[PDB]
């Protein structure tokens, strides 16, 4: 009866903005990645130190669901030691991640006439971040060595621009949705599995 | 980022064994998630891939070397060796080491590992004379 | 095993639109992924299309792959040619025996 609340994150409502990326620990709690496999309607589907075929039967410490909006060309960052702007200043995954990447097309339901603007990302950061770090402060990117005073001004910059969201968009500038499941292996009892 | 600096003789007298080292920094070696290989360049010719190898020891050759072809994971010191032995003028080379792109799985369960370079070396220089 | 046979020598005018090809001799060209490097003279290469239509980052959105299955082709396209795209281009499949680079495309911007 307590299937994992897998809807709850992959069908839902709303997604977080990738520079506020939603997290999703669950706990005492049985899961099922067969209404994951036989769905067909992921565009990518990446799986990182596990085969998925195997997923339905191991035993794991606690599963997380780290889940994000990202136009479709920054879906590769989303990979274990990749370079770039959603990698080093949103949503930096571990080299040693074991676990799996999710993403699918949300046009029809997150791309708007007249500009959907309402996910935003990091554009700047001082430091890159440390894999699942999260970052939420609006602080001035100073951009310069002339400094910020909390000012939008000359090579001072708000770190969080817009993703313009039109339904028109190229393949690279759609709306994609994205879950990330990590799948951490701690030395301590099995809290979710799978049989 | 990942930064990847070799560690050659730059000479390497023929017939012997040549050891190159590549120092790696910005990362975890010990990741099995990647793969971690040599490419040779003979000077003003094309690229020719050597082997790579997971933490693992899980290791892929390029046949027409593998002979010749030894390789391992320094795991200590965070960088990996290519030892090549009973070397000729056709071992001159730059040699590059580089790391490939992330070992997955897709949603059908076949494993996609070590198929293409993301970040690559400098390069170092070897003459192989007398 | 098989072949990778790119063309040695490209030139093409600044602006205009060039595109590599990258002909597998034995086996079907959408069996492998297939990778681009970029090596200006001296210098280290670096990927420029991985995953027969991916980017790593920085990479300029003017790179593109594509594959043909009828010629049994990979294609590099860039697209609006600069000054300082003069490279050598290199196409790399694998399989689990061996990988293959291809020879080497030399590319120069003419004008």
């Known amino acids: 009866t307590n299937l994992c609340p897998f809807g709850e994150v992959f069908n839902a409502t709303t997604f977080a903005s990738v520079y506020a990326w939603n997290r999703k620990r669950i706990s005492n709690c049985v899961a099922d990645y067969s209404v994951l496999y036989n769905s067909t309607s992921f565009s990518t589907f990446k799986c990182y130190g596990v085969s998925p075929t195997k997923l339905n039967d191991l035993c794991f410490t606690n599963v997380y669901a780290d889940s994000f909006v990202i136009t479709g060309d920054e879906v590769r960052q989303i990979a274990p030691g990749q370079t770039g702007k959603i990698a080093d200043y949103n949503y930096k995954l571990p080299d040693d991640f074991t676990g799996c990447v999710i993403a699918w097309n949300s046009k029809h339901i997150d791309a708007k006439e007249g500009g959907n603007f309402n996910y935003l990302y990091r554009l700047f950061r001082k430091a890159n971040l440390k894999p699942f770090e999260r970052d939420i402060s609006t602080e001035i990117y100073q951009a310069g060595s002339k400094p910020c005073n909390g000012q939008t001004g000359l090579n001072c910059y708000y770190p969080l621009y817009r993703y313009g969201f039109y339904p028109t968009d190229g393949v690279g500038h759609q709306p994609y949705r994205v879950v990330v499941l990590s799948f951490e292996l701690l030395n301590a009892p099995a809290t979710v599995c799978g049989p | 980022q990942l930064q990847l600096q070799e560690s050659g003789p730059g000479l390497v007298k023929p017939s012997e064994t040549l050891s190159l080292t590549c120092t790696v920094s910005?990362?975890?070696?010990?990741?099995?998630?990647?793969?971690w290989g040599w490419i040779r360049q003979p000077p003003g010719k094309g690229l020719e891939w050597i082997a790579s190898?997971?933490?693992?020891?899980?290791?892929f050759y390029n046949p027409s070397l593998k002979s010749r072809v030894a390789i391992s994971v320094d795991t200590s010191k965070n960088q990996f060796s290519l030892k090549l032995s009973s070397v000729t003028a056709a071992d001159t080379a730059v040699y590059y080491c580089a790391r490939t792109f992330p070992s997955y799985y897709d949603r059908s369960g076949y494993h996609y590992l070590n198929y293409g370079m993301d970040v690559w070396g400098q390069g170092t220089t070897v003459t192989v004379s007398s | 095993n098989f072949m990778l046979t790119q063309p040695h020598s490209m030139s093409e005018s600044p602006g205009k639109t060039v595109t590599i090809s990258c002909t597998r001799s034995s086996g079907s060209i959408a069996s492998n992924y297939v990778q681009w490097y970029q090596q200006r003279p001296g210098s280290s290469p670096t990927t420029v299309i991985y995953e027969d239509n991916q980017r790593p980052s920085g990479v300029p959105d003017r790179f593109s792959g594509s594959i043909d299955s009828s010629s049994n082709s990979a294609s590099l396209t860039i697209s609006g040619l600069k000054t300082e795209d003069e490279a050598d281009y290199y196409c790399?499949?694998?399989?689990?025996?061996?990988?293959?680079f291809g020879g080497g495309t030399k590319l120069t911007v003419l004008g």
């Open positions: 190898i997971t933490y693992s020891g899980r290791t």
């Open positions: 790399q499949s694998y399989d689990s025996s061996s990988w293959v």
């Open positions: 910005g990362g975890s070696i010990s990741s099995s998630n990647f793969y």
